[PDB]
Amino acid sequence: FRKMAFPSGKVEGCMVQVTCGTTTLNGLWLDDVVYCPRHVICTSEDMLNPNYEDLLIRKSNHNFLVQAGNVQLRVIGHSMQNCVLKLKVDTANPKTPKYKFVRIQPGQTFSVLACYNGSPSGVYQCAMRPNFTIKGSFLNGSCGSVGFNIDYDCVSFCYMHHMELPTGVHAGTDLEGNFYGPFVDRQTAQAAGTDTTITVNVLAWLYAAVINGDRWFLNRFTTTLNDFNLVAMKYNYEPLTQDHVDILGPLSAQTGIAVLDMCASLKELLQNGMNGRTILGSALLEDEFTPFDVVRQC
Amino acid sequence: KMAFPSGKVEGCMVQVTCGTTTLNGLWLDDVVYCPRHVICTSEDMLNPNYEDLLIRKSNHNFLVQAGNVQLRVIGHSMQNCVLKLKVDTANPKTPKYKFVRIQPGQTFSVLACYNGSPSGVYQCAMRPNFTIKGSFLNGSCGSVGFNIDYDCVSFCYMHHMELPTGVHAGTDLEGNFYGPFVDRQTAQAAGTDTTITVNVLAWLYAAVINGDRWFLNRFTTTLNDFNLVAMKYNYEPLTQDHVDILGPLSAQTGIAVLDMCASLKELLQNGMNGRTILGSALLEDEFTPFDVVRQC
Ligand SMILES: *[C@@H](O)[C@H](C[C@@H]1CCNC1=O)NC(=O)[C@H](CC(C)C)NC(=O)O[C@@H](C)C1CCC(F)(F)CC1
Numbered sequence: 001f002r003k004m005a006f007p008s009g010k011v012e013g014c015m016v017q018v019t020c021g022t023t024t025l026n027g028l029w030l031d032d033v034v035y036c037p038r039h040v041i042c043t044s045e046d047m048l049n050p051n052y053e054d055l056l057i058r059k060s061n062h063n064f065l066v067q068a069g070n071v072q073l074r075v076i077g078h079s080m081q082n083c084v085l086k087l088k089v090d091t092a093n094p095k096t097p098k099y100k101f102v103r104i105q106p107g108q109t110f111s112v113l114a115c116y117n118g119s120p121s122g123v124y125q126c127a128m129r130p131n132f133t134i135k136g137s138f139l140n141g142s143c144g145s146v147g148f149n150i151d152y153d154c155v156s157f158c159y160m161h162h163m164e165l166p167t168g169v170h171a172g173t174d175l176e177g178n179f180y181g182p183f184v185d186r187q188t189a190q191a192a193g194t195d196t197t198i199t200v201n202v203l204a205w206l207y208a209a210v211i212n213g214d215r216w217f218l219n220r221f222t223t224t225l226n227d228f229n230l231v232a233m234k235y236n237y238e239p240l241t242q243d244h245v246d247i248l249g250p251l252s253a254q255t256g257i258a259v260l261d262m263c264a265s266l267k268e269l270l271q272n273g274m275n276g277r278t279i280l281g282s283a284l285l286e287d288e289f290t291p292f293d294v295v296r297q298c
Numbered sequence: 299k300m301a302f303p304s305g306k307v308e309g310c311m312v313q314v315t316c317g318t319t320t321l322n323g324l325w326l327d328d329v330v331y332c333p334r335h336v337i338c339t340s341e342d343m344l345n346p347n348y349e350d351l352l353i354r355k356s357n358h359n360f361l362v363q364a365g366n367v368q369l370r371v372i373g374h375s376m377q378n379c380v381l382k383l384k385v386d387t388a389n390p391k392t393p394k395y396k397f398v399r400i401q402p403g404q405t406f407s408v409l410a411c412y413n414g415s416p417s418g419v420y421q422c423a424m425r426p427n428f429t430i431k432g433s434f435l436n437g438s439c440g441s442v443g444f445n446i447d448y449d450c451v452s453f454c455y456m457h458h459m460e461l462p463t464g465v466h467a468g469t470d471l472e473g474n475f476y477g478p479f480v481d482r483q484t485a486q487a488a489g490t491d492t493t494i495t496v497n498v499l500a501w502l503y504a505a506v507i508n509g510d511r512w513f514l515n516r517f518t519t520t521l522n523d524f525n526l527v528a529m530k531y532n533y534e535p536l537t538q539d540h541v542d543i544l545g546p547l548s549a550q551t552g553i554a555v556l557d558m559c560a561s562l563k564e565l566l567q568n569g570m571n572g573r574t575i576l577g578s579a580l581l582e583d584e585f586t587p588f589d590v591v592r593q594c
C-alpha cells in the first residue's frame with residue numbers, strides 16, 4: 001500500500017503569490033477572491049506578537065502585490081477572517097474548480113501541494129495527527145500552500161499552511177482561518193499535545209490486511225466500544241468515536257468482520273505484541289491510511 | 299515521498315477503446331500514445347501476434363475520448379509496444395516535453411489513471427531488476443511516469459502489466475520494455491532484485507538532517523571494502539560517481555560519504571535492533587540524492 005496523493009492540477013490552477021513589502025507567500029485564487037495567511041502583512045518587528053488589527057489598518061488595497069506567475073492581479077478589497085486575509089481581485093479565476101471549504105478531524109488525510117513563490121513544487125499525502133499537527137515537508141516560503149481532498153469533480157480545501165513548531169512538525173488553519181489545535185500565528189515557540197496513534201486508521205489497515213489474505217490476528221472474541229477505548233488509551237491510542245465506527249462500515253461489510261471484533265483483535269495485538277510476526281509485510285501498525293484511503297486504493 | 303505536481307500531465311490524458319478493451323492514452327500535439335495491447339481481445343492477450351492483429355484494424359476501430367469529446371483517428375502506427383494514433387485535433391494543453399529512458403535507481407512520479415481520468419499521483423523508483431512497485435489496477439494501462447524540470451515534462455514510463463509478485467512492468471515512450479518482460483498475458487518472473495545503495499545512503503543523510511542519528515558510528519571503510527559487503531547483501535555497488543553525487547549531502551551534515559557507508563555496513567550486518575529510521579523498520583531505497591536535496 002502506497003501513500004497516494006490526489007492529482008494536483010485543479011489546485012495548481014488556483015495558486016498565486018502574495019507580497020507585502022519583501023514578505024512573499026502563497027495564496028489561493030478562487031473566483032474573484034485570493035485567500036492567504038494574514039501574517040503576510042508582517043515585518044520582523046511584528047512577527048513576535050503582531051497586532052494584526054493595527055497592522056491591517058495601515059494597509060490599503062494598493063499595498064498588496066498579487067501575482068499569478070509574473071502577471072499582477074489588481075486588488076479591489078481586503079478583509080481579515082480569523083487568521084486568513086481575503087483579497088478581492090478584479091478578475092475571476094477561469095480555472096476555478098468546483099470547490100468547498102471543509103474542516104477536517106484528526107486522523108483524516110489530505111494531499112498537500114507544496115508551493116514556493118506561487119509555483120508548485122510537489123504533492124504528497126499528509127495525515128492530521130491527533131495533536132493537530134502534520135508532518136509536512138514545508139520550507140521557508142511555503143506558507144499559504146493548501147491541503148485538499150477531491151471527490152468526483154469537487155475540491156474540498158481543508159488546510160492552509162502557517163507555521164513550524166519547535167519539534168519540526170507543522171501547523172495551520174482551515175480556509176476560514178481557524179487554526180487546527182492550540183496554535184497562534186506568532187513567531188513564538190509553541191508546544192503540541194503529546195501525540196497518539198490514530199486507532200481508526202490502524203483498524204482500517206487491519207481490514208486492508210484481511211482483504212489481501214493476511215488474517216492471522218483475527219480472534220473469536222469481541223469487546224464493547226467503551227472497554228476498548230479504556231484499554232486503548234493505556235497504549236497511547238486514540239479512543240474511537242461513533243463516527244469512526246461508522247466510517248469503518250464499508251470495510252466491515254467487505255470482510256464480514258464486525259468493527260468490535262476487529263477492535264478485540266487489535267486489543268490482543270496491543271496486549272501481546274506481534275509475537276515476531278508481520279502484517280502486510282510490516283512489523284509496525286500503520287496509522288496514516290484512512291478507511292477511505294484503503295478503499296480508494298484497493 | 300513527494301511527487302511532482304501532476305497538472306501538466308492530467309491535461310494530456312485520454313481514453314482509448316478498441317472492442318471491449320479500454321485503457322489510457324497520452325495526447326501530445328496531434329498524437330495519442332497508448333499500449334498496443336488495447337487492440338487485443340481476451341483470446342488475443344494469451345499469445346498475441348501484434349503485427350497480425352494490427353493490420354486487421356482500421357482507424358475507425360479506435361475510439362479516443364477526451365472527456366466528453368471524441369477525437370477522430372486519422373492515422374495509426376506501432377512503435378515497439380506502443381501504438382501512436384494520429385488525431386485530427388491538436389492538444390492545446392500539450393506541455394513542453396521530452397521522452398527519456400530512465401536508469402535503474404532513478405525515481406519518477408506516476409499519474410495513475412482509469413478511463414482517461416486521473417486517480418492519484420505517487421513516486422516510484424525504477425528497480426535494479428527493472429520492475430516498479432506501483433499501485434495499478436485493471437484499466438490503469440497507459441498511465442505514465444514522468445519527471446518535471448522547470449516547465450519541461452520528461453516522460454519516462456508507460457504502464458503495461460503486473461507480475462505474479464504484484465510488482466509492475468512497462469515501457470519507455472518509444473515502446474521498449476524496461477527489463478526482460480513481454481506484453482503477453484503470461485506469468486513472468488523478474489530477475490533477483492537488489493537494493494539501490496546510493497538511495498539508501500541519501501535517505502540515511504535525510505535521517506541525520508532531521509536529527510535521527512542513532513545508527514552513526516566512528517568506524518570507516520574503503521569504497522571497495524564497502525562494496526564487497528554490499529554485494530554480499532544484494533545491494534548494488536556504489537560507484538565514485540555515486541560518491542560524488544552524495545557530496546552536497548555530505549557537506550551539509552559533515553558526515554563523509556565513506557563514514558555513512560560504514561554506518562550502512564553495520565546496519566546490514568547487525569540489523570536495526572527493532573529500532574526505526576525516519577519512522578521505518580526497513581531501509582528505504584526509493585529516494586535519490588536529488589530527491590533528498592530538493593526537500594531538505
Ligand atoms: C492494463 O491493461 C493492465 C494493468 C494490470 C491489470 C491489473 N494490474 C495491472 O497492472 N494490463 C494487463 O492486464 C496485462 C495485459 C497483457 C497483454 C500484458 N496483463 C497483466 O498484467 O496480467 C496480469 C494481471 C496477470 C497476473 C496473473 C498472472 F498469472 F501472473 C499472469 C499475469
Ligand SMILES: *[C@H](O)[C@H](C[C@@H]1CCNC1=O)NC(=O)[C@H](CC(C)C)NC(=O)O[C@@H](C)C1CCC(F)(F)CC1
Pocket residue numbers: 025039042047138139140141142143144162163164165166167170184185186187188189190
Ligand atoms: C511561512 O512560509 C512560514 C513557514 C515555516 C518556515 C519554515 N518551515 C515552516 O513551516 N511560517 C512562519 O515563518 C511563521 C510566521 C509566524 C508569524 C506565525 N513562524 C514560524 O513558523 O517560525 C518557526 C520556523 C519557528 C521555529 C522555532 C520556534 F521556537 F518554534 C519558533 C518558531
